Design a binder for this molecule. Structure first.
Ligand SMILES: [Zn+2]
Ligand SMILES: [Zn+2]
Ligand SMILES: [Zn+2]
Length: 572
C-alpha cells in the first residue's frame, strides 16, 4: 500500500479507491482529484472511513484525523484535523487531465484525444483505465447457448434475455464451454471454432474477458540522438536491392528510436528485413499486434534471411493458424517474430514494431516493458486503419491520436518516409497521394486503364446495424458478365453483411476493408454500401483502393469520394 504518485512520482500511502485502477496519488494531487470529481474514497493501509461503529461516512472531504483514527464531523473528537484542507489530503510523506481520464466512460473521441495528448505517466494511466473499462463492458453482453446444430459450419443460437447481444463479426471472439475460441457470422448463423469440435447442443459462448495488467514502461522510451551508429555494425557489401534504404538504416543506428511512414506498397517489410542484412550480426525482434502482420514479416524474412536464425513465437493458447516455416518458440534465435501479447522478456539490438497504426498505447508500453533494446524502429502508416475502439461511439478518432508513434508522425513528421508506391496502378496512387499523403506519394506503375468508378446509391438494408446494398451487388454482377477477367477479383466492402451477400451472389472471395489491410490482390471490387462516417472514413477509403495491383472497380455512395477517384467512370 505504499508507492509513487501517477502525476508527480512523489511517494505516498494514498490511492484513489473510486478510480478503477486505484492509482497512487500524493497529498497535493489526491486533494485536487477528490475536490474536483465524484471520487471521494481515499485508500491508505486502512481506508479513509469513519472509524465510529456503524457509521457510513466514506467521503474524505467530510472526514478528520482524531489522533490516529478517522472520523466524520458527527463522530470526531475535539482535537482533530480535517483530512482535506490546505490543498492536501492527509497521508505519509506530505491534474485537470488526470480527472478527465479517471472519470470518463471512453465513449467519446475527446477521451482518446486526451489519453494521447497528456503527459507520459498519464498516457499509461489512460491506457490501463481504458483497457479495464473495455473488459468490464464484455461482461454486459448476454450468453449465447446452442439451441440446434445444422452442419459443420452452421448452427442456431439461443440468447440471454435482458442483456444485449454483441455484434456478429470476426472482431468479436467468444469462448466455448473451454471447447476453444469461436467466432460467428450472420435464423441460420455461420460458426468458426479455432479447435475442431462437434458442437454440442446446450454448450455456451462468452466473450474472453482477460485481466488488465498494470503498465510500467513508457509508450516511447526517451529519444537519444547519436553522432555515430551505436551498438550496430554495418555491412559494406550491401545488396543493390536494399541500397535505397542505406541512409535510412544509418539513421536507425544513430537514434534510440525511429519512425517510418510507409504508404501502401512502398516497401515496409522489404525495409524491415533489409535492416537485418544491413546490420548482419544484430539480434532483431520483429513484432506487430496481429498474427497476420507478424506472418507477413516472416514471409519476407524467409526470402532474405537464413531460416536457421529465425523463430516464430506462438502462444500455447493457439487462436489462428500462423507461419509454419521457422523453428517454433526458440526465444534465443537471432531473428524472433512474435505478436506483442506473446512477447517474451528479452533483449535485442533492434526491435522492429510493424503495422504501427494498429497499435494502442497499451501495446507500445508492453513492448517497452518486455523488450530492452539498443534501437526501436516503428513502421506503419497513420493514413491506414487504427485498432477498433469498441467503446468509442461518439466522434471520430484522428490519426494523430491513434497512439504516441502516430501522434509523432502527424505532428513533427516521420523520421523516414517511403515515397514510391510500387503496387498500385497510377490512378490509385494519384488519388490517395492527394487524399491522405499531401501529394508526396509517387506512382511507379503507369495508369493501368483498369480503374473504374460508378456512382450508384442503390438501396441500403441492415442486418442489425451492419449494412447491405443488394443493388450495388447487382451492378457488380452485371459488370462481371462483361468483364470476365474480373472473375478473379476480391470483393471488398466496409461491412461483413454486405460481404456475406456478395459471397452468395457473386462467388468472389470477400474481405472487409479492415481485414484487407496489409494484403494485395490483382483485382478488387469495392462497394461503398452506405454514405456513413464509417464507409466515408479517408483512412478506410485509402486502404480499400490501395489493395489493387492491376484493376479496381468502385461502386460509390458518396459523391465527394467518388469525385476524388481519378478513375474512368462507367455508365448506369
Ligand atoms: Zn502528485
Ligand atoms: Zn479517482
Ligand atoms: Zn462518523
Amino acid at each position: 500500500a505504499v508507492g509513487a504518485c501517477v502525476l508527480c512520482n512523489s511517494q505516498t500511502s494514498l490511492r484513489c479507491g473510486a478510480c478503477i485502477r486505484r492509482p497512487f496519488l500524493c497529498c497535493k494531487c489526491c486533494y485536487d482529484h477528490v475536490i474536483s470529481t465524484s471520487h471521494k474514497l481515499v485508500l491508505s493501509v486502512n481506508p479513509y472511513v469513519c472509524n465510529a461503529p456503524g457509521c457510513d461516512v466514506t467521503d474524505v472531504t467530510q472526514l478528520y484525523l482524531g489522533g490516529m483514527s478517522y472520523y466524520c464531523k458527527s463522530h470526531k473528537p475535539p482535537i482533530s484535523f480535517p483530512l482535506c484542507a490546505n490543498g492536501q489530503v492527509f497521508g505519509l510523506y506530505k491534474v485537470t487531465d488526470f480527472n478527465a481520464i479517471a472519470t470518463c466512460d471512453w465513449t467519446n473521441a475527446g477521451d482518446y484525444i486526451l489519453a494521447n495528448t497528456c503527459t507520459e505517466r498519464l498516457k499509461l494511466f489512460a491506457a490501463e483505465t481504458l483497457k479495464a473499462t473495455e473488459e468490464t463492458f464484455k461482461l454486459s453482453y448476454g450468453i449465447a447457448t446452442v439451441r440446434e446444430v445444422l452442419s459443420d459450419r452452421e448452427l442456431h443460437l439461443s440468447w440471454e434475455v435482458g442483456k444485449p447481444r454483441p455484434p456478429l463479426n470476426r472482431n468479436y471472439v467468444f469462448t466455448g464451454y473451454q471447447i476453444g475460441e469461436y467466432t460467428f457470422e450472420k435464423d441460420a448463423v455461420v460458426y468458426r471454432g479455432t479447435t475442431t469440435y462437434k458442437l454440442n447442443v446446450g454448450d455456451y459462448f462468452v466473450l474472453t474477458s482477460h485481466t488488465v495488467m498494470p503498465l510500467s514502461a513508457p509508450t516511447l522510451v526517451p529519444q537519444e540522438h547519436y553522432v555515430r551508429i551505436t551498438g550496430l555494425y554495418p555491412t559494406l557489401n550491401i545488396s543493390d536491392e536494399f541500397s535505397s534504404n542505406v541512409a535510412n538504416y544509418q539513421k536507425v543506428g544513430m537514434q534510440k528510436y525511429s519512425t517510418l511512414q510507409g504508404p501502401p506498397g512502398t516497401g515496409k517489410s522489404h525495409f524491415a528485413i533489409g535492416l537485418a542484412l544491413y546490420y548482419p550480426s544484430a539480434r532483431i525482434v520483429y513484432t506487430a499486434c496481429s498474427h497476420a502482420a507478424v506472418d507477413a514479416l516472416c514471409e519476407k524474412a524467409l526470402k532474405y534471411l537464413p531460416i536457421d536464425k529465425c523463430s516464430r513465437i506462438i502462444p500455447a493458447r493457439a487462436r489462428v493458424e500462423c507461419f509454419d516455416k521457422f523453428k517454433v518458440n526458440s526465444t534465443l534465435e537471432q531473428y524472433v517474430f512474435c505478436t506483442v501479447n506473446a512477447l517474451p522478456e528479452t533483449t535485442a539490438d533492434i526491435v522492429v514494431f510493424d503495422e504501427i497504426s494498429m497499435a494502442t498505447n497499451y501495446d507500445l508500453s508492453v513492448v517497452n516493458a518486455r523488450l530492452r533494446a539498443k534501437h526501436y524502429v516503428y513502421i506503419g502508416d497513420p493514413a491506414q486503419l487504427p485498432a477498433p475502439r469498441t467503446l468509442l461511439t461518439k466522434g471520430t478518432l484522428e490519426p494523430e491520436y491513434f497512439n504516441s508513434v502516430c501522434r509523432l508522425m502527424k505532428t513533427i513528421g516521420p523520421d523516414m518516409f517511403l515515397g514510391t508506391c510500387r503496387r498500385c496502378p497510377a490512378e490509385i496512387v494519384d488519388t490517395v497521394s492527394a487524399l491522405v499523403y499531401d501529394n508526396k506519394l509517387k506512382a511507379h506503375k503507369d495508369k493501368s486503364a483498369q480503374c473504374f468508378k460508378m456512382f450508384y446509391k442503390g438501396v441500403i438494408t441492415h442486418d442489425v446495424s451492419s449494412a447491405i446494398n443488394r443493388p450495388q451487388i447487382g451492378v457488380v454482377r452485371e459488370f462481371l458478365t462483361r468483364n470476365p477477367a474480373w472473375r478473379k477479383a476480391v470483393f471488398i466492402s466496409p461491412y461483413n453483411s454486405q460481404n456475406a451477400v456478395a459471397s452468395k451472389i457473386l462467388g468472389l472471395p470477400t474481405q472487409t476493408v479492415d481485414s484487407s489491410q496489409g494484403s494485395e490482390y490483382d483485382y478488387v471490387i469495392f462497394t461503398q454500401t452506405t454514405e456513413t462516417a464509417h464507409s466515408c472514413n479517408v483512412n478506410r477509403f485509402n486502404v480499400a483502393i490501395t489493395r489493387a495491383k492491376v484493376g479496381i472497380l468502385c461502386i460509390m455512395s458518396d459523391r465527394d469520394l467518388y469525385d476524388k477517384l481519378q478513375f474512368t467512370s462507367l455508365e448506369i
